[PDB]
Amino acid sequence: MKFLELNKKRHATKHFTDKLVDPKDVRTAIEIATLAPSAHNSQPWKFVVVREKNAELAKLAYGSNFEQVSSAPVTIALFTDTDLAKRARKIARVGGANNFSEEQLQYFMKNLPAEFARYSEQQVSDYLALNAGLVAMNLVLALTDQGIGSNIILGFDKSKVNEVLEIEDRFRPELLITVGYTDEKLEPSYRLPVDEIIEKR
Amino acid sequence: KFLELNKKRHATKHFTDKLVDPKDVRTAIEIATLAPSAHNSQPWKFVVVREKNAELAKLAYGSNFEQVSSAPVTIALFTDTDLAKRARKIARVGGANNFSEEQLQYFMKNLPAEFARYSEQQVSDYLALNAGLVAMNLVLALTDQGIGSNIILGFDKSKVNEVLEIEDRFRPELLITVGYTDEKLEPSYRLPVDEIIEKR
Ligand SMILES: Cc1cc2nc3c(=O)[nH]c(=O)nc-3n(C[C@H](O)[C@H](O)[C@H](O)COP(=O)(O)O)c2cc1C
Ligand SMILES: Cc1cc2nc3c(=O)[nH]c(=O)nc-3n(C[C@H](O)[C@H](O)[C@H](O)COP(=O)(O)O)c2cc1C
């Protein structure tokens, strides 16, 4: 019904008008987006709202991503926390006894980190990438709900992003999300027929 | 009213006996896959488990065992580890009816070439992220239909293909239990927004 309607108006936006994007709207969209579930409720994410370093950042984008990042009034660099033990502890420290029982606090302070310590490098890397996908989706929908266009960009030079945006190396860049109002009518892109991608077991 | 939809999505762990209509599951999946994906590669497979649940449940760790046993449906979400094959599938199925000359060549030639250059980790991260995008959309789609869900990462990935009889080309990403909920759930904790935002 109404969620279908939201989805039909989300498009990959590549050309933006000059209309200003209100930081109150960006903050709201991000606050809705983080209601997203995450494995362990680890919420291992950091949103870097770029309004000043856009031209610099754009030099890291490949092909036509260069023009998208240069023009977009806002780009949100989505980072994930590669120190999953510190991320669990952060949740315990910030939430505290006002949000958590003693059992829950021990879990985030000690149990969970002990679990994370036994993850392979691929397990960690997949975990962060997956949780970034969950929240990135919620974010673009939240923007769309406010009438704001966006595009998720993976074609950029991840190795320079921390340096350019002055973010601790503990955080790795996952995605750039350009944010702005759209200067062109767009058509829905192709999706496989649903019965093509469903299996019954 | 997206804020409101989000506020009614919860991690649901105990379900009522109300049946889950296969039509609703199909519809939620159809909406979910409106999700964007990198390159529009849409590298997903949704395995709707209605008959093999008890056996699937043995692969799920700790408290997840009971969720997978109890849920009237679990959707096992797989990604396509053969991305060149996925690109060419899109081109085959979509065809001339959906794609221009240039678009067809992009999916049959250019895209598989790009995929060939990715490291093993890059490929793993690509499938994981795309799974997260669509899993989020599925879970909201279900919510919008009054249906509860929980995403489960705590399961034995090495045995899911054998148990569910799914070709090894596809790798299990997540189990998503689906059913109507039997308890008042309160929202779980989220960090204050100004704690997860930097300005640059
Ligand atoms: C990727 C992911 C993996 C999850 N894995 C499990 C799990 O294995 N066992 C479980 O009981 N819940 C699992 N969940 C549920 C989370 O604990 C839950 O979504 C989180 O605590 C946030 O609370 P909320 O969903 O009510 O907002 C998982 C959720 C996500 C998104
Ligand atoms: C994970 C992901 C990565 C993407 N990377 C790029 C990119 O590198 N460059 C670009 O121009 N668009 C990028 N996009 C846009 C995709 O091409 C687009 O989302 C996809 O074709 C689906 O189209 P739609 O969102 O309009 O439905 C990306 C989208 C996703 C979700």
**Which own/partner pairs from A87-91 qualify as long-range (CB within 8 Å, at least 24 positions apart)?**
A87/A42, A87/A43, A87/A44, A88/A40, A88/A42, A88/A112, A88/A113, A88/A116, A89/A113, A90/B191, A91/A41, A91/A42, A91/A43, A91/B189, A91/B191
A87, A52 contact by CB (below 8 A): no
Locate the chain A residue with the closest alpha carbon to B38.
Answer: A154
Cβ of residue A124 closer than 8 Å to a chain B Cβ: no
Partners of A56 on chain B (C-beta within 8 Å) are: none
Which one-letter amino acid corresponds to residue A167? I
Cβ of residue A24 closer than 8 Å to a chain B Cβ: no
The partner residue sitting opposite A165, judged by closest CB among B89, B130, B200, is: B200
Cross-chain Cβ contact A94/B195 below 8 Å: yes
User: How far is residue A184's CA from residue A179's CA, in Å, rounded to a whole number?
Assistant: 14
The phi, psi pair for A48, rounded to 5°, reads -105, 105
Token pair, residue B176, equals 């998503």
Cross-chain Cβ contact B34/A133 below 8 Å: no
Our CA angle for B121, B125, A85, nearest 5°, is 95
List CB contacts of A194: < 8 A, sequence separation 6 or more.
B26, B29, B30, B33
Resolution (A): 2.0
The partner residue sitting opposite A49, judged by closest CB among B6, B166, B199, is: B199
First to last CA, chain A: 28
Closest Cα to residue B125, out of A161, A126, A8?
Answer: A126
Token pair, residue B148, equals 């509860």
Ligand 2 lining (C-beta closer than 6 Å): A 11-12, 64-65, 151-155, 189; B 36-40, 129, 133
Q: What is the number of other CB atoms lying within 10 angstroms of the CB of residue A104? A: 17
Q: Residue B174's beta-bridge partner residues?
A: B77
| Ordered structural domains, chain B, with CATH | 1-200 (3.40.109.10)
Which one-letter amino acid corresponds to residue B120? E
B34, B137 contact by CB (below 8 A): yes
User: How far is residue B189's CA from residue A95's CA, in Å, rounded to a whole number?
Assistant: 7
Residue B153 CB less than 6 A away from ligand 1:
yes
Pocket mutation for ligand 2, best pick of A68, A76, A140, A154 (most atoms within 8 Å of C-beta)? A154
Q: Residue A172's beta-bridge partner residues?
A: A80
Residue A41 CB less than 6 A away from ligand 1:
yes
Cross-chain Cβ contact A136/B132 below 8 Å: yes
Token pair 């979400």: residue: B77
The partner residue sitting opposite A34, judged by closest CB among B34, B128, B196, is: B196
CB pairs under 8 A between A and B: 214
